[PDB]
């Protein structure tokens, strides 16, 4: 018996506070998971640096991570023979996880400790999670190959401080003795540690061995038996790999801990032989629009590590992809400038571009809810897609999700695919209403006309959607119906006008004469017609913005065109013109009339002859 009565948890902004949501993980053992994940990236750094100096092995070639456990003192001791950590990698990173001032980018200049967000994404997760179940975490590390006396002692019990002291350890790699709290004996029980280790260690290439100690009379046999499959997730059989081992390997190679929506483990041989394993994050990275990486693929050449977070294997449009790539054909002496310049990496990243296409298209058809999560985190990124490659824009348009009139929500749940299913009989034209603001899309009157006839509309309300609009003129052999104008097609059909009848027009005739002679030659003509809408005044146009774009049109007078002075039309019935008609007094008659004028001009230009004429009359009727 428990009884889950009531709930409620709403928290956003700042990475650290979002880490604390899945810090608990409903497991606690997420600490041991992430701890060995750093020992995997330590083994990575070692095998890379071993290409520049094999002295790092110190003779001992056994690269492994060993977990020993004690009941008496209550200490869980995880010790890898990786690169370890230098005095730098401890003080300049673990110190910046404690009190220093990394903030989000940096306390002072906002640049120096900019590259600690990547480092907190990995090591920062294991830090707090360790202290969830550990009373004390003692890190006694030593850099492999480098002098034993430059070994680093580190101590904290979870406070915003660190006790750092230089010690000697002839053993290379990192040795972390976590004094677990009394009660956390589970992580010190053999069977439990077996299940815990295996769950993540199977994604890890580095053999994770355990203290199989037999404590018998005289026979106190200490043996180290590997609980992991001891095989790198990209090179082992996809049949042996379960879906979680992918999700868990992501957290290592991405320097993260979130659950990826989907992945793509494909091997491609030929001239360019590589094994690719890409993923799709459930989060938008902090550094998405920053000049540093949080996207990228960990470069391996022939199962050996070179560099992490290498975005050089992925186009900037596909920056949403996170994973790794093991090229067996690529040079082992390769560098980031080789990756930027050399043609082999250009053809390699284009060979990875298609792995992205399959992974997205699948996720789209498979689970559009996960693809909706992807789209609301990485939409702006994929919006560059149809705007670059207009050739395959139809194929990318299946991936494109827009906000529509299907709901009054800002959620881009409706697709061009969804719309194909929503299409009416005879409908060859997909109706679009475009705006750089969501509230400006909601300022559209054309919506009421679509509402009456029962045909569906896209509410384009994003910044970079206008860039794709330069190319996205057709999808699936079906053109778009742009709301670009209202036209004189309804010329003599203007009878369906509520009750704006000739009774009103008899009272309009003196009003017409007064307005035309009040405005004079700054307007072409003031015609009183029956446009309903919430707009009290609207204009009629001849050609391109009346005449603001052509040859003959500017050949009329040159200066702005005389014809361009728009045809000032009003709604006699609408309360603004009606309250303007109630006011016969010249001062306030001209206040209303010239207001409605520059309002209509503002609608068909965006710019005014006199902005201050308008802004006086506009703000004055709002205030007085």
């Amino acid at each position: 018996m428990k009884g889950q009565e009531t709930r409620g948890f709403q928290s956003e902004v700042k990475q650290l506070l979002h880490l604390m949501i899945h810090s608990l993980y409903s497991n606690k053992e997420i600490f041991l998971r992430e701890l060995i994940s750093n020992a995997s990236d330590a083994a990575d750094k070692l095998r890379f640096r071993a290409l520049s100096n094999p002295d790092l092995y110190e003779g001992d070639g056994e690269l492994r991570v060993r977990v020993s456990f004690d009941k008496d003192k209550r200490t869980l001791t995880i010790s890898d023979n990786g690169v370890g950590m230098t005095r730098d990698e401890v003080i300049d990173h673990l110190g910046t996880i404690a009190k220093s001032g990394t903030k989000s980018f940096l306390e002072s200049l906002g640049s120096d400790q900019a590259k600690d967000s990547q480092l907190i994404g990995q090591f920062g997760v294991g830090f707090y999670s360790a202290f969830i179940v550990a009373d004390k975490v003692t890190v006694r590390t030593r850099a492999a190959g480098e002098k034993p006396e430059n070994g680093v002692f580190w101590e904290s019990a979870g406070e915003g401080e660190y006790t750092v002291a230089d010690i000697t350890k002839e053993d290379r790699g990192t040795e972390i003795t976590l004094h677990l709290r009394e009660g956390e004996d589970e992580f010190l029980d053999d069977w439990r540690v077996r299940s815990i280790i295996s769950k993540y260690s199977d994604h890890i290439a580095l053999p994770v061995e355990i203290e199989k100690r037999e404590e018998k009379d005289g026979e106190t046999v200490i043996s180290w038996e590997k609980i992991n499959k001891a095989q790198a997730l990209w090179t082992r059989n996809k049949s042996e790999i379960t879906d979680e081992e992918y999700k868990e390997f992501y957290k290592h190679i991405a320097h993260d801990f979130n659950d990826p929506l989907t992945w793509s483990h494909n091997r491609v041989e030929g001239k360019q032989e590589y094994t690719s394993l890409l993923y799709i994050p459930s989060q938008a990275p902090w550094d998405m629009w920053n000049r540093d990486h949080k996207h990228g693929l960990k470069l391996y050449v022939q199962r050996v590590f070179i560099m992490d977070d290498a975005e050089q294997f992925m186009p900037n449009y596909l920056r949403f992809v996170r994973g790794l790539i093991d090229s067996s054909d690529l040079p082992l002496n390769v560098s980031r400038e080789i990756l930027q310049d050399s043609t082999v990496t250009r053809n390699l990243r284009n060979a990875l571009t298609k792995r992205v296409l399959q992974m997205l298209e699948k996720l789209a058809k498979d689970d559009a809810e996960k693809y909706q999560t992807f789209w609301q985190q990485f939409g702006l990124v994929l919006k560059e897609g149809p705007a670059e490659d207009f050739a395959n824009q139809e194929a990318i348009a299946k991936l494109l999700r827009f906000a529509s009139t299907h709901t009054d929500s800002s959620a881009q749940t409706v697709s061009l695919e969804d719309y194909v299913s929503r299409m009416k009989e005879g409908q060859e034209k997909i109706y679009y209403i475009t705006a750089d603001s969501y509230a400006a899309a909601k300022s559209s009157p054309h919506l009421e006309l679509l509402r009456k006839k029962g045909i569906e509309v896209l509410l384009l309300s994003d910044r970079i959607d206008e860039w794709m609009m330069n190319y996205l003129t057709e999808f699936d052999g079906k053109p778009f119906q742009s709301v670009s104008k209202v036209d004189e097609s309804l010329e003599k059909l203007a009878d369906e006008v509520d009750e704006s009848a000739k009774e009103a027009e008899k009272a309009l005739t003196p009003f017409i004469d007064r307005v035309k002679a009040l405005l004079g030659e700054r307007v072409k003509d003031v015609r009183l017609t029956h446009r309903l809408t919430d707009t009290p005044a609207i204009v009629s146009t001849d050609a391109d913005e009346m005449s603001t774009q052509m040859a003959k049109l500017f050949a009329a007078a040159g200066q702005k065109v005389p014809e361009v002075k728009y045809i000032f039309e009003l709604n006699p019935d609408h309360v603004l013109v009606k309250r303007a008609a109630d006011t016969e007094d010249e001062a306030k008659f001209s206040e209303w009339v010239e207001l409605l004028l520059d309002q209509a001009l503002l609608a068909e230009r965006g710019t005014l002859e006199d902005p201050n004429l308008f802004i006086r009359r506009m703000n004055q009727l709002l205030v007085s």
Partner: protein
């Protein structure tokens, strides 16, 4: 969700096709098959409106660039001499010292006091006596 028809249509005024960007980024995505260029347009219907009320505003003037008339003129004579060259001797900012602008304003005072007292003396006279 979908409101009966489909469309949660809302307020209305005017419409414009959004645009500001066209040159951006580099070139690298899928393959060669260039043909998605075929637009369309059209409009032929108008609907009614339901907006008719009268609220109250809070009267106050408005600032900006200001110029206008009155109807008034008169002149003088005296002084007259000139020699300069546009360089940077008296090229500097200052303007105004102190002024009036006391045209009109509505002042609202408020203050109250009741308070009272009573106090009076009495007239005590002396007796008189006379004899033959």
């Amino acid at each position: 969700m979908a409101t009966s028809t489909l469309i949660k249509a809302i307020d209305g005024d005017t419409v414009k096709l959004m645009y500001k960007g066209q040159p951006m980024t580099f070139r690298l995505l899928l393959v060669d098959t260039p043909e998605t260029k075929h637009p369309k347009k059209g409009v032929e219907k108008y609907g009614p409106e339901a907006s008719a009320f009268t609220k109250k505003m809070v009267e106050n003037a408005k600032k900006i660039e200001v110029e206008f008339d009155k109807g008034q003129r008169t002149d003088k004579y005296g002084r007259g001499l000139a020699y300069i060259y546009a360089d940077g001797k008296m090229v500097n900012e200052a303007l105004v010292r102190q002024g009036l602008a006391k045209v009109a304003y509505v002042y609202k005072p408020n203050n109250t006091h009741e308070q009272h007292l009573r106090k009076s003396e009495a007239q005590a006279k002396k007796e008189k006596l006379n004899i033959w």
